[PDB]
């Protein structure tokens, strides 16, 4: 019998796989007999053991085929086609709800019976994040609500401050909570066109550590980053559709997404200042360093920079009414789990431990 | 049986779709059973539920096909070919008539019983816009005339007020009324070839926020936009037919379209200044800002910016005789529908609120 | 039955069509029934209504086909091959005779009863053009004879003078009379290879708006242009074959065509000036301005730009015996028609109206 | 009969071969009759004599085939697909454990009776290396742990010092021990995008000899290398995923791997220094130089720069319990062999010979 | 019957022909009857007259075939695959032995019964070459050893001195002896990437006449070669594998080969001077110039350029025991032939003639 190109496409759609070689590689693993499959018996990775039994008969015939990459390319095109349909037609509030449902699905597995992490350590993460800025939950609620409402010329937030201040730490967490991509505009102007092509159909972008000019009085090395941005004003404004590049494509036309710009304390033009609706002054704090020096499980597990940590913070601090009505059911269950496995006295103690510069679990 | 490539091309033309992945993604939705289709039950997106039953049989066979992107590329080529044929053979009045018809069809959808907006909020839009310039209604009709008559040299309009003065606000609204593209002449002259190539077959160009030099005493930052335009004089003049580099292909030959140039108050070289038929001196108005600070639904819904708002202004103010003969059947229904929903005192009350800087609905 | 590729190729040849999306677009229009086609009844476009009845059968089978763009690419290459053979094997006098024959076919269609032009406005245009330069009729024949004779390094003419002087108007008219292309060598050496890549197999070239240096005391801005032309001497001399280049094709070695250079009062280096046969010293004339301010149909209809006005002038001022013996038959029918529809006193009145700077038709 | 593409794909995965021409050439060597094969009789290369008999019948039919390169491209893509699966799903400890197994398999071949290597020269290498820096086996273990844990912003080590200080020697041995790629960031910005794309799916990267500025007071020539690294800060930080590109590919998005930077005593910006967790200052030593003048075999055989030498140092110095549990059985077997063939006093005499700057084997 | 693709591949293997058009052209010449081929009867070209009679029957079916360039590309990729198997699996001693075998095969033809060359004139060349430097046969042997051992960093030789000193003459002779390529790193810093890509799988690389800066006090013009070479240090050192690229291929990772740098008397950085294991200063000398004015056959037949002359020099001067054991038996037969056809007094008279600046054969 022949290969079913449809059954491959189902696997690609269900695993949301948009890399041709990753799809090829995993579909090849299914060729071996399911009765003995060691990865299935060891339960190693979700995207194998769920699917092998359904796909085995087709994977065996796929392994003989002469067209293997042409099958996978069509299957990957289908996943990209789905994403472009969704990006035009869904409301941004529903896109965020779709993103949260995937993050809650991760949280089920990580803290599950087949779990691999401790919820007490991740809540220690929340306590460290709440110390970084005054009214941390208000800032994160403002950020979500801004990215959902997407008001013209009030679309970008500026994160400013000296070295090792936590601006990247917060940006990276927001960039996993919301789906998005990072962009580096410190490169020269003639490559900039392909670089900005990564924003195609993305919900959020982060421009990381934009180098300025006039840094020499502060010992900061100068560069063209700030000057490249001031050539891109209409990409920031979002009033008009802009023609985004891609390799092996024509220009493709859309509103370029909202985002975060991070920089050191350079000067900024008035023309560029008119685009940023909000500015966050990140401060180095000596006591926050002394905590991490004793509590390194946070960084080895990448806790304080993951989007799962901010979702746990929103589950703790915000009312249920500010989640969209469909996900309120799952959010309520998670509030009951955090009320079960902690107390307010432990959480108040954890914040005190961080502020004292001792170990959070002390 | 085989896929009908003809039926796919009918959907592509009926939905005016010229992106290959978008056509692919939407056509795959039709493979599911029509009797259960939740998107049809919700009547959510027009270009789904009008078509599913007509195309369902062909989508079941397309789902098994091994040629999916090959089919859709030819369907997209057919839509692109129609647009080129039109661009050579239609008169500019027919093009603008076909453009107004498309807008009017969207007005029927937005303000219907399946509607999503209130026509008062958009007539509030007309009241806000009419304050921005003296006699806005007549400046629009002069711009429309100029783009239809396309007289050599007498082709471009210059918008050159100070910062944050509404030049983008009017430019984006005129851009959607007529159809066109924004172009980035501030990017590098060795790739500007592939930027101007976006103007192939288009009706308007807007050259967004052209940077000059010599404004630095007034804090205006330097850039090369003005020097690039002063190299493109034959493109602006529109006497001769110029050569446009369509990406990955050899050049097209055509008259580069008319359009709007937006800039801050830099100096313009005398050689370039002659290319502009008329100039608009925008300014900040503090009362107009405070009106928006209260009437926030105007910004959130993009009401002050969409071409539907200028068309409602044209429907309200101008004599029916200024519109081409085939749309006069539609305009007069909308004139009756506008006089039905509004009194003149209410509209004067809107404009009075704008001049006082209070909310337009107050 | 099956698609016949010969029939598509014949349509492309007869319409002299060399763009693939344009050929695809028009041939698709023939798929509908001939008995009721509005386009065939309205007589809108010649290249439709002449051809639908012949091709209906093939266009119906073409709409079912899966190789549509493959057929059109071979058909366009047949038209491109024909231009290659002609430009290698014809004499330049026969090339110009072929070009005049094509323009007379337009004149038949324009002034025949299905057209829309008024010949009184075109002969007013002839009267207006003759005032732009002294002895204009001699100059056109001197330019034409130069392009037919093509003596080495005596191949280019220089159009020079103040801004707003009609040099582009006359150059664009002379271009349409001859054929040819415009090139903008103010675009950078970073891309200049593909710019001169437009001159392949052309009869005439216009280098538009060439920027010099050292014009600041005359308020002229500087640029690269004159240094690019003075780097391109091997192209302007035309003694030897030069390796012209266009993307996704090999270089083709040929003699680069002769042409017109348009510039303001920049300095021209002594090495470059030795490439020009003669210069024309344009300057503004006040009466020509006040004439166009009133005879405004000239600019709107582009009458002073079109080569049809220059050809109607050559019909008026030159002997029959300057034209080739194959075309003299048509020329005498047109010469009779201009006497039958005018008089000498009417033409004298038109020129005097231009000299008075009033409306030409008065 | 016909070619089995499955048998080629087995050989490609067996030999872990990812160059298409290399695979093609080696598989063609199997076409000749096995009964007489000179390379098999001579045992010259494992990847031949192990595999010829299994593959011969398929190679005989493959040698007739008209599609040979297409077959080999599918076989190579299957091997890149495997690596793409491993890099996303394995732990970094498993990756290193797998890599050590590959090196231990080479040691069995090198020091078998079929192999050419002499263990005394390779242990002479270990003695020399342990003199280059204090506590070398602690430094190596610390580095290996740092690469496994991959802690954000604590990922890169800086090797600094004079000319001929041994920093390249030690980096090359580490780079073989845990497989990675060397990158040249001294070339201009416009080629960096392709060059940085070599890091896709690699465990480790080394930036060799990055040129700075301000060296001229110390005879060191300036370059842009340090400025380029100061633009790439987010690649060094590794907090967020960056967009990496090959030629003729779309981008791959991943965390850019940990690494080593080697440089001479140019100044480092304070923004860049914060990315480096540990700096090693190398120094020239006369006894090491004079020793290498006498034990020339070390340099001819490339012993001091090979990862096998560092693995031998780890086997001799580190406890078994520091190695991963699944290879402790192999390490114990090698520890027994080393104590069987060396005393400590032989090795202490080797180190004394090195400190004396006489020949290691004296 | 059909084309045997295997027989075309055999011919490509036996002629080492790795150009697609050359293979196509030569194989097409076999289609004519071999009974009366004049190139065969005149024995004009070995790659023809040896092979025509075997391939005639296949060339007749090849001449009718429609896939001719597809057959040739597979045949050429088979030769390229053989080279890449060899460059990894052979020892560098075998590579040089294989190269010397190929030169000896030419020499037997050149000096055979169909020989166009005269061994007297070529040994006149050996006499001239041995005068260019002291102890030339030891310089040559020291070079060969250095290339065969390829010791890290001790890899490159520098040829330095005034114009017309013979440094290119010796580099070209050593390049034809070993095989390899010449690279011009004076070309711009971006084209440099594909220029260096020519080194893939090569044995030698020769960098020709690299420009320094700061020589205008001694009439030597500035350039960028020495600044570029100081950026390529990791390629010269050969400690690490480096990334090499060809157009429309991704990078090949290998140790960049050893060889020779030729330069006039510019100053060299300490950083680059540390890479060179030996420097030769060449001085212009009058007697060699006056000899060549009378010994003109040397330049015309390119005798002093040729690796055949250096091999003849090694056969004359060096012991047999220095050559590899498999080639030694051919070396003995060539030593006998030189002692037969030259006495010592003939050769010593030639060296006296060179010193006298008279004709070598005088
Ligand atoms: N506010 C803070 N005060 C002190 N230490 C901090 C703070 N925030 C983060 N850190 C420490 O500094 C490390 C780096 O933080 P991070 O990269 O987020 O800073 P950044 O200010 O965004 O840096 P950069 O300017 O280099 O982009 C963290 O891993 C943590 O150990
Ligand atoms: N005439 C005006 N007076 C005051 N505020 C204005 C005016 N026009 C627009 N606004 C406010 O300024 C915001 C930005 O308007 P807009 O982008 O059109 O200005 P611009 O002058 O074109 O900007 P830029 O200087 O950035 O090119 C609007 O969203 C509105 O809030
Ligand atoms: N000789 C003239 N005297 C006065 N007005 C003129 C003259 N020639 C042209 N014009 C006016 O100037 C407009 C522009 O003409 P055109 O583009 O041919 O001028 P040009 O001198 O070639 O231009 P440029 O200075 O940009 O090279 C015309 O449409 C007409 O209205
Ligand atoms: N510590 C040392 N002391 C003396 N000589 C050394 C030392 N280390 C290496 N060498 C010698 O110098 C040669 C080059 O070593 P290597 O290339 O590793 O040095 P490096 O300091 O990294 O060089 P560079 O500054 O040129 O990049 C070695 O082959 C060895 O002969
Ligand atoms: N040692 C020498 N003394 C004088 N003339 C020489 C010497 N060697 C070669 N010649 C003459 O100089 C000519 C050029 O030699 P060659 O090109 O090898 O010199 P070069 O020093 O490498 O030159 P350049 O500096 O131009 O690269 C030879 O063909 C020969 O005629």
UniProtKB/Swiss-Prot annotation, chains A, B, C, D, E:
Q: Which cofactors, by name?
A: Mg(2+)
Q: How is it modified after translation?
A: Phosphorylated on both serine and threonine residues. Small t antigen inhibits the dephosphorylation by the AC form of PP2A.
**GO annotation terms (biological process):** bidirectional double-stranded viral DNA replication; DNA replication; symbiont-mediated perturbation of host cell cycle G1/S transition checkpoint; symbiont-mediated perturbation of host ubiquitin-like protein modification; symbiont-mediated suppression of host innate immune response; symbiont-mediated suppression of host JAK-STAT cascade via inhibition of JAK1 activity; symbiont-mediated suppression of host type I interferon-mediated signaling pathway; viral DNA genome replication
Q: Name one GO molecular function term.
A: ATP binding
Q: Where is this region: Binding to host TP53 protein?
A: 72-362
Binding site residues for Zn(2+)? 37, 40, 48, 52
What are the EC numbers?
5.6.2.4
Activity regulation annotation text = DNA helicase activity is inhibited by ATP-gamma-S.
Q: Which residues bind ATP?
A: 161-168
Keyword Transcription assigned to the entry: answer is yes
What do the Gene Ontology cellular component annotations say? Answer: host cell nucleus
Region (ATPase activity) residue spans: 153-351
Q: Does the keyword Hydrolase apply?
A: yes
Cofactor annotation remark:
DNA helicase activity requires Mg(2+).
Question: What's the catalysed reaction?
Answer: Couples ATP hydrolysis with the unwinding of duplex DNA by translocating in the 3'-5' direction; ATP + H2O = ADP + phosphate + H(+)
* Superkingdom per UniProt: Viruses
Task: Describe, by residue range, where the zinc fingers (T-ag D1-type) fall in the chain.
Answer: 1-92
Main location per UniProt? host cell
Residue ranges of every copy of the SF3 helicase domain listed in the record? 135-295
List localization entries.
Host nucleus
Alphabetical UniProt keywords: Acetylation, Activator, ATP-binding, DNA replication, DNA-binding, Early protein, G1/S host cell cycle checkpoint dysregulation by virus, Glycoprotein, Helicase, Host nucleus, Host-virus interaction, Hydrolase, Inhibition of host innate immune response by virus, Inhibition of host interferon signaling pathway by virus, Inhibition of host JAK1 by virus, Interferon antiviral system evasion, Isomerase, Magnesium, Metal-binding, Modulation of host cell cycle by virus, Modulation of host E3 ubiquitin ligases by virus, Modulation of host ubiquitin pathway by virus, Nucleotide-binding, Oncogene, Phosphoprotein, Transcription, Transcription regulation, Viral immunoevasion, Zinc, Zinc-finger
Instruction: Report further notes.
Output: The sequence shown is that of strain 776.
Record's function text: Isoform large T antigen is a key early protein essential for both driving viral replication and inducing cellular transformation. Plays a role in viral genome replication by driving entry of quiescent cells into the cell cycle and by autoregulating the synthesis of viral early mRNA. Displays highly oncogenic activities by corrupting the host cellular checkpoint mechanisms that guard cell division and the transcription, replication, and repair of DNA. Participates in the modulation of cellular gene expression preceeding viral DNA replication.
Tell me the subunit arrangement: Isoform large T antigen forms homohexamers in the presence of ATP. Interacts with host HDAC1. Interacts (via LXCXE domain) with host RB1; the interaction induces the aberrant dissociation of RB1-E2F1 complex thereby disrupting RB1's activity. Interacts (via LXCXE domain) with host pRB-related proteins RBL1 and RBL2. Interacts (via C-terminus) with host TOP1 and POLA1 allowing DNA replication. Interacts with host TP53, inhibiting TP53 binding to DNA. Interacts with host preinitiation complex components TBP, TFIIA and TFIID to regulate transcription initiation.
How are the domains described in the entry?
The J domain is essential for multiple viral activities, including virion assembly, viral DNA replication, transformation and transcriptional activation.
| Name assigned to this protein | Large T antigen
Q: What is the protein's species of origin?
A: Simian virus 40
Residue numbers of the full-length protein present here: 266 to 627 of 708
């Amino acid at each position: 019998k022949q290969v079913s190109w449809k059954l491959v496409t189902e696997y690609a759609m269900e695993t949301k796989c948009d890399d041709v070689l990753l799809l090829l590689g995993m579909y090849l693993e299914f060729q071996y007999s399911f009765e003995m499959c060691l990865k299935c018996i060891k339960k190693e990775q979700p995207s194998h053991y769920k699917y092998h039994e359904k796909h085995y008969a087709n994977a065996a015939i796929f392994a003989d085929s002469k067209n293997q990459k042409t099958i996978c390319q069509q299957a990957v095109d289908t996943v990209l086609a789905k994403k472009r349909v969704d990006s035009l037609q869904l409301t941004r509030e529903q896109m965020l709800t779709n993103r949260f449902n995937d993050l809650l699905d991760r949280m089920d597995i990580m803290f599950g019976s087949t779990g691999s992490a401790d919820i007490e350590e991740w809540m220690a993460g929340v306590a460290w994040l709440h110390c970084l800025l005054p009214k941390m939950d208000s800032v994160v609620y403002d950020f979500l609500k801004c990215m959902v409402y997407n008001i013209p010329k009030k679309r970008y937030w500026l994160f400013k401050g000296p070295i090792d201040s936590g601006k990247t730490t917060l940006a990276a967490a927001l960039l996993e909570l919301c789906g998005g991509k990072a962009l580096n505009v410190n490169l020269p102007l003639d490559r900039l066109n392909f670089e900005l092509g990564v924003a195609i159909d993305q919900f959020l972008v982060v421009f990381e550590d934009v180098k300025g000019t006039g840094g020499e009085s502060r010992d900061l090395p100068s560069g063209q980053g700030i000057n490249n941005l001031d050539n891109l004003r209409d990409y920031l404004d979002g009033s008009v559709k802009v023609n985004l590049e891609k390799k092996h494509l024509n220009k493709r036309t859309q509103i370029f997404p909202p985002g975060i710009v991070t920089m050191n304390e350079y000067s900024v033009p008035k023309t560029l200042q008119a685009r940023f609706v909000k500015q966050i002054d990140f401060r180095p704090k000596d006591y926050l360093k002394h905590c991490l020096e004793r509590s390194e499980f946070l960084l080895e597990k990448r806790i304080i920079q993951s989007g799962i940590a901010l979702l746990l913070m929103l589950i703790w601090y915000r009312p249920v009414a500010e989640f969209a009505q469909s996900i309120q059911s799952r959010i309520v269950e998670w509030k009951e789990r955090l009320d079960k496995e902690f107390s307010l006295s432990v959480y108040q103690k954890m914040k005190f431990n961080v502020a004292m510069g001792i170990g959070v679990l002390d």
